[PDB]
Write a structure and sequence with these properties.
This is part of a larger assembly, with 5 copies of chain A.
Chain A: E1 2-5, E2 16-19, E3 31-32, E4 36-37, E5 45-46, E6 50-52, H1 61-70, E7 73-76, H2 82-94, E8 112-115, H3 120-129, E9 134-137, H4 144-158, E10 164-169, H5 172-179, E11 186-188, H6 201-219, E12 221-222, E13 225-228, H7 234-243, E14 247-250, H8 252-255, E15 264-267, E16 270-275, H9 281-284, E17 293-296, H10 301-318, H11 324-330, E18 332-335
Parallel strand pairs in A: 6-7, 6-14, 7-8, 8-9, 9-10, 10-11, 11-13, 13-14
Antiparallel strand pairs in A: 2-18, 3-5, 4-12, 15-16, 16-17
Helix pairs in contact in A: 1-2, 2-3, 7-10
The structure holds inosinic acid (IMP) (5 copies).
One inosinic acid (IMP) binds near residues 53, 226 and 250 of chain C.
Chain lengths: ~325, ~350, ~325, ~350, ~350
């Protein structure tokens, strides 16, 4: 009466370690987020490799202005009305422009917007009109087919004039299916979308990074990878970049800040902030209009990001790497017992 | 510096035997149950002879499984992770297969069919034209507005002639949402204790009964307001017969099983010899082969081989009827009324 | 060959959380400890909801003076001779003396623990020494003998002597001591000289107490005995139905505690032992046995000031200016 | 915060390092005796039943006496009810009989109403008494043993407990106890509400008290019989307990499984089970509120603490258990209990594994 | 704070399927070049360990009738071991492993200390194969021991070495001229210390990694060095998994210590017959020059009865994979990881 299960082994970022082998302020954290051919330059280059998650608790217009000021991009959450998301995008695009400020060709704050695989025919034109610099399908591993239909719609109507990412995927088949559908980048994570959650983020990132590099040799097209979720400590960021991720999406990290849209609460003499995932009914069933957890209040986004990126820049110096591609080439990543 | 916001399994519960000294014959125990909603005092439109249905899975419910389970009085829900044409062909193959047995008006077998929240506008008519007796929304995210829009579509076109169930839910909000949307029966995510169906499935026979008790409490509360009884389906996590009796006693009207049925000859998977012992291949609906059926090796697990469905179901229900005699119940409604369910803190070998 | 056990589920304080929905110094921490009728005023109202345990390692005359100064009551331990306990009670009532808890004669309020054995000689001696309130230091398994001590006090003194009883964990245990005339009911798993779930027991008795409050109109205050690990557990117990809290290890860490201060690996600690230890259960043999050590925390004044300031701060977030307001407005959720 | 605890080990972690089993003498004393002299009461088998409402009544006392053991009628009842149970065993007409050739029975007493319960049980014909305390050895057990030695001297034999240490043994010994009970079942001197699992007794307290008993016998020349209280169901644990120094073993849930137990038999899904509850339960602890059979109005949620598997008759099971106890003694090279305690090579099993 | 720089057992692996009498359990012991035959070829892929409690002269004869070779333990005097090797090689002869003289093939263990006087006495007594029993793993003293035999006997005397767990360990003993390489599967480590692991709890990770290094060394030099899985196996399925993972033959200690031919005493442990046992890490083995029971293993009867049972299931398992000999199993077997096993 025995049953055998054959699940592939997965690991987290805490099971690995960057082994070092000289000015930390001389390290460039610029990274691409739009696919580019060999030798060419990406259409959108961030100044820091941080993006905020596509969640009601993370990415509003206040978060988008703050993160763009530091060199990142916020992906405004799409579990709201089409008019609200476009209005949120429009407020970032019109807030007047911090040496690492990320601006477009018209000197406006760069911002992203999340879309779903359902109302994209009405949602994409409104977000494009609002000035969204880049889009990202906010889905999970098991909805890859409907991510492909959404990418096909964008490419059929806009060609390559609208930048759109897709995710999440965890393996080669998921990466290649979105890659050949025209995804300008690919998000890697065990969650995403309105699916409920329960890491395996390191294994997922390593597997997709191997398929991405293989896809680069096969086609000459470099597709940036976004590691979505699983960053608990600042040394995990450098580890994710070294494993192949070109930028990192974080939710809980940004929900702690002043610019986060959730409420600040005093919980036993310690200031905390409300938090919930997109699997919550208030997010999954936003059309019908409840706290999942609390995260500790951390202060301003600028103060925390500068601390996190100083650790990243100083770690890359110890590895003899002055930029992210150089880190991905010289990094020694070993297991920790 | 971080805080989150309990569940129990069927292994933690026990039925206290009734006080009666009168002898109870297990063969006189009736296992009939309703599967579609009905008003207070009226008879359900569909009544199964046994409280077992097969899951909406590629590795469980094909046409052969549909004929075998209908012969024993149950209903199979043909899986919908396939083309609309191949699903209607499997539905028609069970209906047109010539015929205790669960039959419709035309003495044909009773079969079910799963639907999704995307192509229902063209899949629901094809399945009804194929002769499906009851439908069920197979959702991977739980109760959502897309389950509602699918339910609104069926009601707006067929009224109440076509019966469609929906799920999964675990709490009162989920039940009342699908109940107020017109669902004929509500499915409870017992196997994983969650509303979603994702690639990582829970172990065999490790279902969570807490979700079933919570929805049964909302169903009885809802039945007391509107006078409408919504049949509850306990979905997954059960293989042991005593867990079937517990599920029924806790308020479940019928039980959906996947891995329980994949062990049988009529399962559509391949039988393999694993060092003498016969085994059966298996994979969940969250696997890439099912989730990406439009794009078309692929073995998630080996389940033990258990022979024929007729032999195994007869043994499982022989113990269910015997357990209901010990509780003093001759039918499932009596079980839900007379069951003294206690919580077991621990067990021990002597 | 299986055996089946049917133990009731029991949760600790660490599994619950107070969710908020005001100046902290405006919060009143006063609370009753003697039963009062619907709308009446209790015979003894503490200024802070803290009382010290009935233990050799906790409540002596120095503890009673220090805790009464802050507004609490110490229950002098009864695992000793009748003269020794009465002398310590007398030492507190005769200490000369803003939130100070005083009786009608401007004397420090103190309690005293009695057992279910020598009460016929110990109760009058404690009454004569000036004990403002008594408490039967027992456990769940001695409810009958807790009643007989209550039946003795009520028979000889009526309601002129206030006496509480504990511990109980159930509805059936609360009503038994309530009918016997207990002025308050102590809730806890331990208690007495037995050897050693506090949240579940507190929620259960609070329901039985509230139900008993509608049947009779008499409000019997509840004392949560033991299980307070952190300062935010205090506001949790109060919001769950407890009117005051009994702490043992919390108080033995202070200077005013009678235990020896000990340097242990550079960290100053203090000795500690429970009433189930031989030195306490069999005090008659004694007219060394250290069960555990607790960290030396400093003065009772400075620590109680910090613990209550957090309590007052949490109640402000919950929109409660007093303990009764807290027990009505508090939103308590389960926390994994 | 640092705390103090001693390493405790169960019976399953010990092993006896290695004859006709029928010739083995399972006889053992249960009352103290001076060096060289015999014992007043010599059981034929080393088993006694627990002073519990769910174990020892008149039927249990009769059946266990026919097999050579003694039952201790529970005191969690009226003095009249316990005296009637003791009297029914005596006046009921191998077997363990007294001088009058009546069944030998024991009775439990508490430290509260001993001035009326002890005379009533002695009048009823109790051959031996035992103090049941929920708090462990205390001054109230001393005052109870002082009263018995004052009114009856040594005519009435009384045991006390439970203990887990040297000081506890010497306290009841210097108080005049005829035998001393070791809190093996829960590893504690107390009998509280929650109970340990079936067969999870702590041998550490038995070994520590056996060392104190052997040292007390070396000074005064008085041998105090030791009782291992509970925590044993397996036959090998019985031989282990006897080997570690226990002169006789008291079992609760071992005897509750039998038909001679006063609890209800229940058909649970085709398997016969018996209701069970410990002496820490309110029905036993608050027995003064159900004095005339008020406990049969209690429901399953209120009255039944546990389901134990029905094991049939006492005589059938004890014969199976003792037949293997006698066979285990053969592998150790011992024909009697005293020889076991001197020849037993007891070792610690660091681990067991399947091959 | 104290960062430290992952192994799986045989229980976590499963052979994915694609006449058991037709199956050949023959396997080589000694090195050979691509194309030629092996100097010593087994009939069954089982050897007994180099331990006081497993390999006497009785075990050498019994394992020789069934087709295996026993390595006589070297924790004894040089004359005592030589007399044990002599008795097996002088005991008169269906699957027996015999030399050209039609005498029983037997092995003997040596150490890196007295080899200059112990190796001659063992070869002089007729030991076919030798094996270095090391306590620290692969080291220089194992290389100099190998340099001694190759300098005095050339390649006439065959000597194996171990234990290794890694690629560097295999290549070190390979370049040093070892005839076979032994892998520390039982303890998953390079050493053989006091505390031994559990029966049947061997680590397959060391066997896979060394087989990867053995196949690389074979493709670069054309010299096949047989691999030995040393310990941690009593289950027949773990034998087939080890053979499929690259191991050519398996070394077992507690598996053979349970049989009547074991040198230990048979005891009656409460109606159940048991066998005494102790590892080479015990003082009675490591302090054999100065001159009790570490464990009780279950008595299983005779070697012939149980070994025939284990190998009949090994042949039956090899049929379910589609392999008729051990080389074919190493090429056709599909080995997968079992995330978990559940009971229905
Ligand atoms: O409720 C959920 N449903 C689905 N995905 C989630 C949920 N919560 C978090 N995630 C995923 O985890 C990410 C958050 O990363 P983190 O909070 O920094 O660990 C999101 O961007 C999603 O990809
Ligand atoms: O891929 C899977 N992951 C998680 N849940 C699944 C998966 N496939 C099916 N399910 C659910 O689990 C049920 C099967 O329950 P079972 O009887 O435990 O096999 C199905 O009816 C679905 O509700
Ligand atoms: O040794 C013991 N026996 C019985 N109860 C105890 C013992 N030790 C502590 N307690 C109980 O626990 C309380 C102290 O709780 P604490 O502040 O959490 O240490 C005391 O007032 C008793 O009710
Ligand atoms: O209610 C209980 N709680 C804790 N200990 C108990 C209780 N009832 C009986 N005991 C003790 O445990 C023994 C029973 O051991 P048993 O053989 O494991 O059943 C009795 O003889 C008592 O010493
Ligand atoms: O004393 C010991 N401690 C640790 N390992 C040992 C000891 N004795 C033998 N071994 C190793 O274990 C192998 C056999 O173990 P087994 O076959 O799994 O019981 C031997 O060939 C040695 O490699």
């Amino acid at each position: 009466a025995m049953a055998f299960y054959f699940e592939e082994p997965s690991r987290t970022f805490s099971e690995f370690l960057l082994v070092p082998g000289c000015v930390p302020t001389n390290v460039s954290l610029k990274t691409p987020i739009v696919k580019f051919k060999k030798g060419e330059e990406s259409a959108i280059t961030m100044n820091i490799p941080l993006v905020s998650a596509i969640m009601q608790a993370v990415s509003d217009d206040n978060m988008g202005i703050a993160l763009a000021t530091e060199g990142g991009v916020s992906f405004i959450f799409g579990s709201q009305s089409i008019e609200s998301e476009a209005a949120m995008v429009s407020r970032v695009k019109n807030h007047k422009s911090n040496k690492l400020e990320l601006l477009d060709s018209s000197k406006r704050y760069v911002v992203g917007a999340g879309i779903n695989t359902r109302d994209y025919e009405e949602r994409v034109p409104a977000l494009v009109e609002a000035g969204a610099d880049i889009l990202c399908i906010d889905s999970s591993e098991g909805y890859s087919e409907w991510q492909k239909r959404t990418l096909d719609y964008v490419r059929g109507k806009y060609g390559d004039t609208v930048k759109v990412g897709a995710g999440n995927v965890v393996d080669r088949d998921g990466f290649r299916y979105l890659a050949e559908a025209g995804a300008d980048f690919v998000k890697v994570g065990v969650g995403g979308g309105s699916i409920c959650i329960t890491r395996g983020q390191a294994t997922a990132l390593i597997d997709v990074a191997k398929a991405r590099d293989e896809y680069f040799e096969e086609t000459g097209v470099y597709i940036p990878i976004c590691s979505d979720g699983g960053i608990v400590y600042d040394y995990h960021m450098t580890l994710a970049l070294a494993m192949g991720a070109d930028f990192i999406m974080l939710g809980r990290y940004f929900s702690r800040f002043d610019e986060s849209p959730t409420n600040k609460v005093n919980l036993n003499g310690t200031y905390m902030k409300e938090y919930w995932g997109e699997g919550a009914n208030r997010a999954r069933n936003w059309q019908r209009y409840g706290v999942d957890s609390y995260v500790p209040y951390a202060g301003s986004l600028k103060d925390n990001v500068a601390i996190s990126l100083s650790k990243v820049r100083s770690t890359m110096c110890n590895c003899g790497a002055l930029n992210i591609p150089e880190l991905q080439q010289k990094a020694k990543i070993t297991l920790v017992s």
